[PDB]
Every structure is written in C-alpha cells, then in structure tokens.
Amino acid sequence: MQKIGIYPGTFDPVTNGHIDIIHRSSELFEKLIVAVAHSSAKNPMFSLDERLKMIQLATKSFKNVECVAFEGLLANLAKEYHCKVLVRGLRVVSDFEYELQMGYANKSLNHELETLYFMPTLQNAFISSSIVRSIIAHKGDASHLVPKEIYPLISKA
Amino acid sequence: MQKIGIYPGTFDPVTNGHIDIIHRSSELFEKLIVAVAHSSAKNPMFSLDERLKMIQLATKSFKNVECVAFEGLLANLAKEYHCKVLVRGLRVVSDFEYELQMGYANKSLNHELETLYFMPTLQNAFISSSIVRSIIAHKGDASHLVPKEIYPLISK
Amino acid sequence: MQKIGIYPGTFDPVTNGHIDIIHRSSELFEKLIVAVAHSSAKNPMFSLDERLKMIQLATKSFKNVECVAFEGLLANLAKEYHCKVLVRGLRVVSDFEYELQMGYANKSLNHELETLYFMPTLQNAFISSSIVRSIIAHKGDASHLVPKEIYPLISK
Amino acid sequence: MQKIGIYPGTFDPVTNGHIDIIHRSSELFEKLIVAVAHSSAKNPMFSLDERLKMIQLATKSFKNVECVAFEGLLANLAKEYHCKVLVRGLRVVSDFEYELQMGYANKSLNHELETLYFMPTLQNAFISSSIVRSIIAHKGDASHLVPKEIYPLISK
Amino acid sequence: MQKIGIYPGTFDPVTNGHIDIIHRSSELFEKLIVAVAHSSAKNPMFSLDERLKMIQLATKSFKNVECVAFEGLLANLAKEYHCKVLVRGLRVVSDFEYELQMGYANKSLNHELETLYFMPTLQNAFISSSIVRSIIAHKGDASHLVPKEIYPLISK
Amino acid sequence: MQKIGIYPGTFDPVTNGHIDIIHRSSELFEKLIVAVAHSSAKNPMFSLDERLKMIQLATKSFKNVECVAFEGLLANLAKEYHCKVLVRGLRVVSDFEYELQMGYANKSLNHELETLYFMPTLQNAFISSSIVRSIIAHKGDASHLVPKEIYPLISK
Ligand SMILES: CC(C)(COP(=O)(O)OP(=O)(O)OC[C@H]1O[C@@H](n2cnc3c(N)ncnc32)[C@H](O)[C@@H]1OP(=O)(O)O)[C@@H](O)C(=O)NCCC(=O)NCCS
Ligand SMILES: CC(C)(COP(=O)(O)OP(=O)(O)OC[C@H]1O[C@@H](n2cnc3c(N)ncnc32)[C@H](O)[C@@H]1OP(=O)(O)O)[C@@H](O)C(=O)NCCC(=O)NCCS
Ligand SMILES: CC(C)(COP(=O)(O)OP(=O)(O)OC[C@H]1O[C@@H](n2cnc3c(N)ncnc32)[C@H](O)[C@@H]1OP(=O)(O)O)[C@@H](O)C(=O)NCCC(=O)NCCS
Ligand SMILES: CC(C)(COP(=O)(O)OP(=O)(O)OC[C@H]1O[C@@H](n2cnc3c(N)ncnc32)[C@H](O)[C@@H]1OP(=O)(O)O)[C@@H](O)C(=O)NCCC(=O)NCCS
Ligand SMILES: CC(C)(COP(=O)(O)OP(=O)(O)OC[C@H]1O[C@@H](n2cnc3c(N)ncnc32)[C@H](O)[C@@H]1OP(=O)(O)O)[C@@H](O)C(=O)NCCC(=O)NCCS
Ligand SMILES: CC(C)(COP(=O)(O)OP(=O)(O)OC[C@H]1O[C@@H](n2cnc3c(N)ncnc32)[C@H](O)[C@@H]1OP(=O)(O)O)[C@@H](O)C(=O)NCCC(=O)NCCS
C-alpha cells in the first residue's frame, strides 16, 4: 500500500496548498504520482501542458514525485500504476460530503482503490486555485499563493 | 395531500438513488407524478426527450407513477395537477439548506404547496447523476449506478 | 404507509415548530401518534408526565392525533403500532447528517421502518426547545415560541 | 473604521435580502458604498449598467449610501476609498467557510481590510438572487422578492 | 448603533481568538462591553469571578473596552446599555446556523437588537476555549493559545 | 511517517466503523497503535479497562496492531512512541471542521505530528458509538454494529 500513491487534481494552477499535500504525502509513499487531469468540462484557465509543466517544476525538489497528465478515469489510471491509494487534501473549504462521495465512487470503479486525506499547513488552509485565478484575472498580485518559480508564467498567461 | 405527490428533477440521467425515492414515495401517495424539468440553465448531458424516455422506462413497474416533462414553474405545475406536495430526496451530498430555501420559495409561489423528504437506501446515499455523467463522459462503466432499463441508452 | 405515522421527540417543551410538524403530518396520515420519549439521558427540564400533558393540551384540536409516552426503542414502538413511517421535522439548525444516520439506524432495527421529513413554517424555522428552556431558566418571556395552551404550565 | 464601509456584490438583481443588509450597515457607517462588481466570470442575467441602475433606484431613500460599479479588485477599490471594512450578508444558504476564505483573501490583498457580517431579517433569510433569476427565467412573478423600484425594470 | 457594542461569552478561558474579536470590534464601536455570562448550564472550568478577572487582565490595553459579568438574559443587559448591537466572532468551527438562530432569538426578545459578526486572524481561526481546557486538564502547555497575562492563572 | 501510526479514540464501544479504519490503516503502516483515551470528561458508558479489553479482542487478527490505554495528552503519547502520524476516520457524521481544528491543535503541541484520514466502508459510514450506546441502553440488539467478539461484553 505504501509503495505508491496518486495525488490527482486539475491544478489550475498549482498552489502553495497543493505543494503542502505533495510534501507530506511524498514523505509517506515510496513513490508519489501527481496526476494532472485534463478536466475539459471545467474550463481550466491554464492548458493541460502549462498545468503539467508548472507542477513538474514546482515538485523538482521532491525526488520520489513524478507528475503525469491523464485523460481517462482516475480509477483506471490507478490500475495501470498498480496503485491502491488516492491521496486528497482536506482544507477548510473542502466539500467533505463530496469527498466521501468521490471516494466511494472511485472504489466502486476499482474495488482495491482507497482514498487517504492529508491536511495542508494552517497558513494554507484557506488557499484555493479559484482565488488565484480571480486575483490574476483582475490583474492583482497572487504571488503569495503559489510557488515563486511559476508565478511569472501565471501572472502573464 | 395523500392523493398526489410530484417528484421533480432534471434526471440527467435517472439513477438508482432517484428510483429508491420513487419506490418509497409511490408507496405513500395514491398517484405519483415524476416531473422532468427542462433545466436548460443547467446544461444537461441528455435532452429533455431522452430524459423523459429514460424515466418512463425506469418506472414502468410502478403502476401508480406517471412521468411528465415540464417547461415552466414547478409551483404552477403543482397547481395544474391540483397537488399540494412536492417530493424530494435527502442524500449525503444533498445541500440541506438549499432544499429548505427551495421549499420556502415554492411555497411563496404557491401557498398550499408543501415539500416532503424521503431517504434513498443506504447503499445509494452517495450516488449522484453527476457521477454517472463523469463516468459516461470518460467512456467508463456506470451500469452499477442506474436502472438496467436505461443503460443501453446512456452507454452507446 | 399512509395508515399511521409516528412523530417522536423529547418535546421539552413542545414548541410552535413541533406543532407545525404535527399540523402537516396529521394532514398526511390517517392516524398520527405523537410519541414522547422519556429521554432520561438528556436531562429534561420537564418531567415525562409534564411533557405528555403539555403536548396533549397543544394537540387537542387535531382529531386524529394521539399522544403517548414511551420508555423503550422507537423501532419497537413502531412495530407495536404496525407503523412503517417515522415523521421528523427539518429546521435550519437540524443536523442533517445525524438525521440520516438515525433514519438508517432505525431501519436497521426494524426493516420496514422509513423516515419521512416535513418542514415547519418559515417564521418557525429557527425555533428550538433549547431556546425556550434558556429563556425560562432566565425568567424571561417565551410565550412567542410555544402554543398558548401550555404557557401557564411552563411559566412558573 | 466607522467612516466608510463597502458592501460589494454582483446584485443580479438586488433583492429584499440585500436591501436589509444595506439598511443595517448604512445605520452603522457614516457612508456606505454599495459596490456592484462586473462579475463577467459569473454570467449575470442583467448587464453591469442595469444592475447599477436597479440598486441606485432601490437605495434612493438611504441618504448616506452611494452606489458605484467596479471592474477591478475589490481590495484595491477599498484602498481607493480609504475603506478598512467590507460589509457582507449572512443568510441561511450562505457558504460560511467560503465567506471566511474570501475575507482572508481580501486581507492578504489589502492588509487593512476587515470583513464584517450582518444578517437580513428572518423573513428574508432564505431569499437569493438565483431564485429571482429562476422565477424570471420561467416567466413567473418575483415581485415579492425584490424592491418595488426595480420591478418595472426587471420586466424589460 | 456605532456608540456601543456588547461582545458576550462564557470566556472559559479567554483565548487569543476572543482577543482578536475584541481588538476588531473595539476599533469599530465608541465603547465595547465584554459581557461574561455565568453559563451555569455549561459547567465552566473557571468560576465567573476567575473568568471576569482573566478577561479584565487580557483587555487592560484596550482603553474603550469594559468587562462585566451578568446573570440573566443578554437581551435585557443590552437594554440597560441602550445597546443595539451584539458582537459575535465567526471562526472555522463556528456553528453557523446556530449563530443565525441565536441572533433571531435575541431579536425576538429585544426588537432593537442586531447581531454583527467579526473574524479573528487566520492564525487563530481554529482556536477554541474547549481546546485550551483539554490541554490544561491534561497538564499540557496551552501558552500559545491564550493571552500571556492569563497563563500563570490557568496553568497546570 | 510510514513506520508507525497511532489511531486514538474513546472507543465507547469500538464499532464496525472503527474496525474498518484499523483494517485500512494497519495495511498502510508497519505498526499501528490503537490508543484508547480515558476521556473521563465524556463520562463513557464503559470503563477504560473495559474499552481497552474490547479493542484488544476486536484487533486480535491484526498482527501489527497493539492497543494501549492512555491518560495524558495524545501529542505526548505520539512523542513517547517516536510516532509522527495520527490516524483518524472520516464518516458521514464527522465534524469535519472540528477534525481540522484538532489536527492543528495536535501539531501545535507536537510540531512534527501530522494527522491522516481514512474512510470506513460505505456500509459502515453511518455507524457511531453513540448509536450503539442508545440501543444497548434500551436492551436492544446492537450485534449488527460491533465486532461479534465484543458483543457479549456490551449486551445489556
Ligand atoms: C481531477 C479530479 C481528481 C478532481 O480534482 P480537482 O478538480 O483538482 O479537485 P476538486 O475538483 O475536488 O477541487 C476543486 C478546487 O479545489 C481547489 N484546490 C484543491 N485542493 C487545493 C489545495 N490543496 N490548495 C489550493 N487549492 C486547492 C481549487 O479551487 C480546485 O480546483 P478548481 O477551482 O480549478 O476547480 C476528478 O475530477 C477526477 O478524478 N477526474 C478524472 C475523471 C474521473 O475519474 N472522474 C470520475 C471520478 S469519480
Ligand atoms: C428541477 C428542480 C426541482 C431541481 O431538481 P434537480 O436538478 O434534480 O435537483 P437539484 O437541482 O436541487 O440537484 C440535483 C442533483 O443532485 C443529484 N440527484 C438528486 N437526487 C438524486 C438521487 N436521489 N440520486 C442520484 N442523484 C440525485 C444529481 O447530481 C442531480 O442532478 P444534476 O447534477 O444534473 O444537477 C428545480 O430546478 C425546478 O423546480 N425547476 C423548474 C423551474 C422552477 O420552478 N424553478 C423555481 C424553483 S424555486
Ligand atoms: C426521542 C428521539 C426521537 C429524539 O427526539 P428529540 O430529542 O426531540 O429530537 P433530537 O434528539 O434529534 O433533537 C431535537 C432537538 O431539536 C429541538 N426540537 C426538535 N424539533 C423541533 C421543532 N420542530 N421546533 C422546535 N424545536 C424542536 C429540541 O431542542 C430537541 O432536543 P432537546 O430537548 O434536547 O433540546 C430519539 O432519542 C429516540 O428515538 N429515543 C427513543 C429510544 C431509541 O429508539 N433510541 C435509538 C434511536 S436510533
Ligand atoms: C462581487 C463579489 C463580492 C462576490 O459577491 P456576490 O456575487 O454578490 O456574492 P457571492 O459571489 O459570494 O455569492 C452570493 C450570491 O447570493 C446573492 N446574495 C448575497 N447576499 C444576498 C442577500 N442578502 N439576499 C439575496 N441574495 C443574496 C449574491 O448576489 C450572489 O448571487 P448570484 O451569484 O446568484 O448572482 C466578489 O466576486 C468580488 O470581490 N469581485 C471583485 C473582484 C475581486 O476582488 N475578486 C477577488 C476577491 S477575493
Ligand atoms: C453567553 C452566550 C452568548 C453564549 O456565548 P459562548 O458560550 O461563549 O458562545 P457559544 O456558547 O455560543 O459557543 C462558544 C464556544 O466557542 C469557543 N469560543 C467562542 N469563540 C471563540 C473564539 N473567538 N476563539 C476561541 N474560542 C472561542 C469555545 O469552545 C466556546 O465556549 P465553551 O467551550 O466554553 O462552550 C449565550 O449563552 C448567552 O447569551 N447567555 C446569556 C443568557 C441568555 O440570554 N440566553 C438566551 C440567549 S438567546
Ligand atoms: C480521544 C480523542 C482522540 C477523541 O477521540 P474520539 O472521542 O473517539 O473522537 P471524537 O471525540 O473526535 O468523536 C468520536 C465520536 O464519533 C463516533 N466514532 C468515531 N469514529 C467512529 C467510527 N469510525 N465508527 C463508529 N463510531 C465512531 C462515536 O459517537 C464517537 O464517540 P463518543 O460518542 O464516545 O464521543 C481526543 O479527545 C484526545 O486526543 N484525547 C486525549 C487528550 C488530548 O490529547 N487532548 C487534546 C487533543 S487536541
């Protein structure tokens, strides 16, 4: 179980909160896969390539982390990695009942697939990518919310 | 009030959860109208025609259930059916406060109109249409979440 | 299902909110049994006998309502009455998840026992027994919160 | 801190709920700015121009209230007004943790900017702009939910 | 409205979270009364005398804050102060609906009496008195959670 | 983080939902400590000795689980075990915000101590110790809710 975990997300863009989750979960698992969903139906501000490349650079210090993009069902991705554990973060604004729902849905699609939750640091408990998008969209400074190495890209496009 | 209840929804698509509510409410009421709203403002995956068809197929075994599509205000539909009871389901991910809000909003539009709530079976307390749509959209198998009568129509 | 419903509670004391629920639910069932639980674990301000007497007085107008006191499990009381429906009220401050939990727990105890939920009037959506108790405990006036027929009993 | 507060919103349209908040908050502050955001990412039914006009008409009676439209960051708008307090309304369907989140986001953007919350009257605690939009969109009568001064302008 | 606000509480003991609310609300009102309730129905850890002394010490730096103890209804205390505003804090674990309930209950007891809500600092958004008590009862170090001037009075 | 985790609780009594959490977490960690707190403030139905005995019987099959009782701070227990991970379960009726609050409180007492959460099986998502207590208090059959090996120890 501890061999591999998958942390899925849209990551639009990657925030300091997501990095907290990566930090703690990469400590626990021998390998952590960060799985960047296309999420076409949401209308992500950043392209799948931009999102993947940003999270790849932001996770360069974590040597047991690999970031990948995926287009299909997360439950199937887990099967292809022989992974029995999805990693999720729980923040103040998490929809807790929706997380339980998604956990059970994923298990119903892949009977071996458990979901485990981590907390970000307290300072990041109220950060969300939607807040970063809103600030950027209104030409404000969101540098306090994201890894500095990706901020110039997002502050532009 | 026991003569007729209306169970409204977008039913995009109808799920095992909705069928549980239909089963339970149809036992209570002499007549149950299952009322499929256009809900154009949501951008439903399935057309109104498709969603009505699916609910008709799924409710064939309930002798006292009639399915209708409607385009206007639910509160007016209730008046048309001389119905004073809306039927809603409460699940885990229900937005409880929003249900209260909608209940009072409907009663403001139609002063006779009460809202009553049923629970699905425990096994179905986490199912949503949204989940079925996500699975469908990613070409996966959602047959465990919807009545067998509709699966050919949603899968291919 | 439609023959008999049971509305259980501690009713410490009965409030205008509880009456709203009795009003709507007694419209729905042929017989509504208002069941007052001893609730020894909670530490009710009013004795079982006082709480029964107050809900009897408050429900005298509703001809098909019978108020009883009970000591045991509700799921068993429903069995005795050949009742398949528990009535609950959903207010602003209801613990929605706890209601679902209780509904499933009662079904686990009595496999035929469903739980159905009604809403009080909007004006009463924020009333609770605990608020009445707090006001009484501080010698204030709770007359705006409870049926006129019980007020001389709770005000002492 | 007393000098000026900003009550921001999409106001699509202004409702009786919003007016309660304006009434209460305009009693507190020497000046209240009602700030109507463009909110393009949301897809407002009424244009920024119409929304500003409706809230101006609706607030004419409050002499210390001024309505303005804005396109940029609220935290910057506050800086422009030398305003240290954002005014928000808390209703039954309010997303409480989302309010705390936005309050903290605004404080990150402008270190002097606090958020204070008011409640509408109980009768308006379940009103929302989306309810008014839904009723309008289904050709219904939403006059009971909005100030009379906007109601001819809501029917264009 | 702007002249005086009352911030009521059990303050068992006062925490850094409460002090944030006192800091924010005292910047708004000409006078802020910190009103320490007996709250006998809680069985508070610290006596009313202890809780009043602690909050008095922790608030000595706020020149326009006065702390008092009170035994009966808050809505009546507000009348003695000709106060139209109760001050409450909203933190992460606040029971949002219970706050609305209590605000409407207070207004029903004193028709002039509004409730306004402030937020503590982010770093204090998860502190509660109950955590302090648990830590102290287990003889642990809660000095990071309460004002430094009270720590020697609560510790071990 | 992977070498040891501690799953704390009052376990009054241990239920099928707690065993799901034990099963999943003992699969993840090399060693799991199940730590039964005195929790005298909660006035448990079962004594600390009884609750420890029950969780011992119920965890016999998990070869890498050890159960202990503890009287002091959990944050210190974790330091005493060279453990930096607390294990918690998330169920339908979990107080989500309260869990986050406790997670941060424990980290503030022990700066290396993280909290991780697991989910029980869906069938057990609505089980609580409080339900089991209510049923057994009324001499009901709670055998469907708890491990068969402890049932004689809680019956009656
Ligand atoms: C990708 C997937 C895991 C959802 O991931 P997600 O969108 O990032 O996570 P959620 O949707 O639950 O969270 C939404 C928001 O939380 C915020 N975000 C999440 N965690 C955060 C944190 N740690 N810090 C800061 N922001 C965070 C952002 O606002 C975020 O995204 P958004 O605003 O761009 O939508 C899910 O849709 C999926 O598995 N898709 C694949 C298809 C599939 O298998 N579907 C069926 C699943 S049952
Ligand atoms: C149709 C109407 C009743 C809403 O019904 P609804 O869409 O099914 O219910 P909600 O919008 O509250 O949310 C339902 C969602 O919960 C889930 N759903 C509801 N109950 C479910 C159950 N028992 N099992 C599985 N899924 C369920 C689905 O995800 C569902 O669909 P969605 O993802 O397509 O939105 C309402 O919009 C309406 O009355 N419209 C007509 C116009 C009108 O009168 N408007 C004014 C109303 S005040
Ligand atoms: C009696 C029983 C139904 C609970 O009823 P209850 O105590 O009135 O309802 P809840 O416990 O869910 O809490 C309701 C609270 O809301 C308030 N109340 C409830 N509905 C209200 C309404 N519509 N308007 C105003 N106040 C209301 C009261 O404050 C009340 O409790 P309080 O006296 O402790 O303050 C339940 O304990 C029971 O079934 N006991 C019998 C034994 C049993 O079967 N146990 C196992 C059950 S699974
Ligand atoms: C405008 C802004 C304040 C949001 O305000 P809002 O849209 O009115 O309020 P919210 O988005 O939080 O959602 C509340 C909804 O309920 C309505 N509502 C709020 N109070 C209400 C009340 N008292 N009665 C009835 N309806 C009410 C709102 O108008 C809104 O309706 P809608 O989305 O259906 O149109 C925010 O988006 C903003 O500050 N924008 C400026 C750009 C910016 O600075 N962004 C970064 C912010 S951190
Ligand atoms: C005193 C009174 C205001 C309640 O205030 P309170 O006890 O502090 O606040 P609540 O009871 O609503 O909940 C507060 C809990 O939050 C936490 N606390 C509250 N705000 C906090 C903050 N900002 N930071 C840290 N901890 C806080 C504590 O855990 C706390 O108290 P507790 O653990 O001692 O119970 C109310 O009971 C009252 O008005 N009593 C007087 C009699 C009366 O008028 N009754 C009728 C009222 S309608
Ligand atoms: C023991 C401690 C972990 C709390 O654990 P707990 O009592 O089991 O968990 P909570 O108090 O958060 O709530 C548990 C309740 O949920 C239910 N329960 C919890 N998980 C459950 C599960 N998976 N299945 C069924 N029931 C469960 C029960 O109703 C339960 O017990 P209760 O009715 O006896 O209160 C905590 O009080 C503690 O750490 N105490 C030690 C002293 C200390 O360090 N205090 C400072 C902590 S910051």
mmCIF file of C-alpha atoms and ligand atoms in Angstrom, chain C residues 134 138, chain E residues 7-10 12 15 17-18 21 37 39 42 70 72-74 88 91 98 102 105-106 127-130 133, ligand 5:
data_model
loop_
_atom_site.group_PDB
_atom_site.id
_atom_site.type_symbol
_atom_site.label_atom_id
_atom_site.label_comp_id
_atom_site.label_asym_id
_atom_site.label_seq_id
_atom_site.Cartn_x
_atom_site.Cartn_y
_atom_site.Cartn_z
ATOM 1 C CA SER C 134 -32.788 29.066 28.167
ATOM 2 C CA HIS C 138 -33.592 33.180 32.960
ATOM 3 C CA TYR E 7 -19.483 41.033 22.996
ATOM 4 C CA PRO E 8 -20.954 38.259 25.158
ATOM 5 C CA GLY E 9 -19.403 34.938 26.043
ATOM 6 C CA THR E 10 -18.577 32.325 28.648
ATOM 7 C CA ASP E 12 -13.769 29.766 29.815
ATOM 8 C CA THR E 15 -8.294 32.840 24.200
ATOM 9 C CA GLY E 17 -9.276 34.138 19.260
ATOM 10 C CA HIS E 18 -11.512 36.182 21.604
ATOM 11 C CA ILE E 21 -12.576 39.826 18.104
ATOM 12 C CA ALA E 37 -22.119 35.157 31.242
ATOM 13 C CA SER E 39 -23.340 29.993 31.973
ATOM 14 C CA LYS E 42 -22.195 24.640 30.983
ATOM 15 C CA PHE E 70 -24.022 39.141 34.047
ATOM 16 C CA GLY E 72 -29.800 36.872 33.337
ATOM 17 C CA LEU E 73 -30.855 37.488 29.686
ATOM 18 C CA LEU E 74 -28.358 39.094 27.338
ATOM 19 C CA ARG E 88 -20.022 37.707 17.748
ATOM 20 C CA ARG E 91 -14.302 31.018 13.335
ATOM 21 C CA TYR E 98 -26.867 28.182 15.457
ATOM 22 C CA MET E 102 -29.367 32.852 18.353
ATOM 23 C CA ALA E 105 -33.845 34.616 19.217
ATOM 24 C CA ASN E 106 -32.185 37.695 20.709
ATOM 25 C CA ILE E 127 -8.569 28.091 18.417
ATOM 26 C CA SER E 128 -11.398 27.356 20.877
ATOM 27 C CA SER E 129 -11.697 27.525 24.648
ATOM 28 C CA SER E 130 -12.513 23.836 24.682
ATOM 29 C CA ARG E 133 -9.408 23.321 28.660
HETATM 30 C C1 LIG G 5 -23.049 33.644 26.700
HETATM 31 C C2 LIG G 5 -23.754 33.271 25.388
HETATM 32 C C3 LIG G 5 -23.518 34.476 24.488
HETATM 33 C C4 LIG G 5 -23.013 32.108 24.683
HETATM 34 O O1 LIG G 5 -21.661 32.507 24.434
HETATM 35 P P1 LIG G 5 -20.493 31.365 24.383
HETATM 36 O O2 LIG G 5 -20.789 30.303 25.396
HETATM 37 O O3 LIG G 5 -19.092 31.869 24.565
HETATM 38 O O4 LIG G 5 -20.563 31.066 22.851
HETATM 39 P P2 LIG G 5 -21.357 29.772 22.480
HETATM 40 O O5 LIG G 5 -21.970 29.172 23.728
HETATM 41 O O6 LIG G 5 -22.469 30.149 21.524
HETATM 42 O O7 LIG G 5 -20.129 28.866 21.886
HETATM 43 C C5 LIG G 5 -18.802 29.259 22.182
HETATM 44 C C6 LIG G 5 -17.732 28.171 22.200
HETATM 45 O O8 LIG G 5 -16.815 28.539 21.191
HETATM 46 C C7 LIG G 5 -15.454 28.649 21.650
HETATM 47 N N1 LIG G 5 -15.126 30.107 21.719
HETATM 48 C C8 LIG G 5 -16.052 31.009 21.205
HETATM 49 N N2 LIG G 5 -15.496 31.965 20.410
HETATM 50 C C9 LIG G 5 -14.170 31.746 20.409
HETATM 51 C C10 LIG G 5 -13.118 32.433 19.782
HETATM 52 N N3 LIG G 5 -13.338 33.543 19.082
HETATM 53 N N4 LIG G 5 -11.816 31.988 19.968
HETATM 54 C C11 LIG G 5 -11.591 30.884 20.785
HETATM 55 N N5 LIG G 5 -12.633 30.211 21.393
HETATM 56 C C12 LIG G 5 -13.925 30.617 21.226
HETATM 57 C C13 LIG G 5 -15.371 27.858 22.957
HETATM 58 O O9 LIG G 5 -15.116 26.418 22.842
HETATM 59 C C14 LIG G 5 -16.771 28.320 23.375
HETATM 60 O O10 LIG G 5 -17.284 28.020 24.640
HETATM 61 P P3 LIG G 5 -17.309 26.686 25.533
HETATM 62 O O11 LIG G 5 -16.405 25.563 25.048
HETATM 63 O O12 LIG G 5 -16.984 27.257 26.917
HETATM 64 O O13 LIG G 5 -18.750 26.238 25.378
HETATM 65 C C15 LIG G 5 -25.215 32.851 25.487
HETATM 66 O O14 LIG G 5 -25.310 31.612 26.141
HETATM 67 C C16 LIG G 5 -25.990 33.835 26.358
HETATM 68 O O15 LIG G 5 -26.425 34.964 25.740
HETATM 69 N N6 LIG G 5 -26.202 33.537 27.660
HETATM 70 C C17 LIG G 5 -26.937 34.524 28.498
HETATM 71 C C18 LIG G 5 -28.387 34.141 28.761
HETATM 72 C C19 LIG G 5 -29.252 34.369 27.561
HETATM 73 O O16 LIG G 5 -29.559 35.487 27.135
HETATM 74 N N7 LIG G 5 -29.681 33.252 26.962
HETATM 75 C C20 LIG G 5 -30.530 33.340 25.792
HETATM 76 C C21 LIG G 5 -29.693 33.615 24.555
HETATM 77 S S1 LIG G 5 -30.802 33.580 23.114
#
